[PDB]
Amino acid sequence: DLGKKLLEAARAGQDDEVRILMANGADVNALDEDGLTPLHLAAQLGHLEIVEVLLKYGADVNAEDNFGITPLHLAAIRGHLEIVEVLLKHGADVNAQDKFGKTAFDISIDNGNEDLAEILQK
């Protein structure tokens, strides 16, 4: 049951346990009990290498969880700039609202992260 094992490893910054699961045909868009994918988890924790190979193996860059939370929101909340840049490069919607009405832009205004704001305007 690979998806599960891959979820649990994208969480844990397991760069290699992830690389291997991929090569065993693990589903990249494995859904967890809350609609969270491996991309969600790796972007949330700032695990850049992992984000990048998940994209390369076809990870849905605009995946919503059952809360309307996207990978982009999660990279934004913890201010992971690099990952934010790469998610945009791969076409994440900057206008996506979670079910609270928040966008990745709103978050950057809320956190006073001036650097993250410019990145979302370009």
Partner 1 sequence: HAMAAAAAGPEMVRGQVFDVGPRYTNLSYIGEGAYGMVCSAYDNLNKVRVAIKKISPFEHQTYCQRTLREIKILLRFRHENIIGINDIIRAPTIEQMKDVYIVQDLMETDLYKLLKTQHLSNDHICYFLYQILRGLKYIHSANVLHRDLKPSNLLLNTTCDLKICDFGLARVADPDHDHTGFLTEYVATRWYRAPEIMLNSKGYTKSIDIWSVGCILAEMLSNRPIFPGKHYLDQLNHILGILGSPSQEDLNCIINLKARNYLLSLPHKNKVPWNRLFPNADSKALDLLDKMLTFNPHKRIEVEQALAHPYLEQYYDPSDEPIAEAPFKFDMELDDLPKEKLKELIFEETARFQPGYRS
Nearest to partner 1 of 25, 112 (CB atom): 112
Please report whether residue 120 would count as binding partner 1 according to CB under 8 A.
no
Q: Are 30 and 4 in contact (CB under 8 A)?
A: yes
Query: Among 93, 98, 105, 117, which residue interacts with partner 1 (rule: CB under 8 A)?
Result: 98
Min dist CB 110 to partner 1, Å, is 5
Question: At what angle are helices 48-56 and 15-23 packed, to 10 degrees?
Answer: 10
Please report whether residue 36 would count as binding partner 1 according to CB under 8 A.
yes
At 107, the amino acid letter reads I
Please report whether residue 77 would count as binding partner 1 according to CB under 8 A.
yes
Output DSSP code: residue 24: T
Please report whether residue 34 would count as binding partner 1 according to CB under 8 A.
yes
The end-to-end CA distance of the chain, in Å, is 41
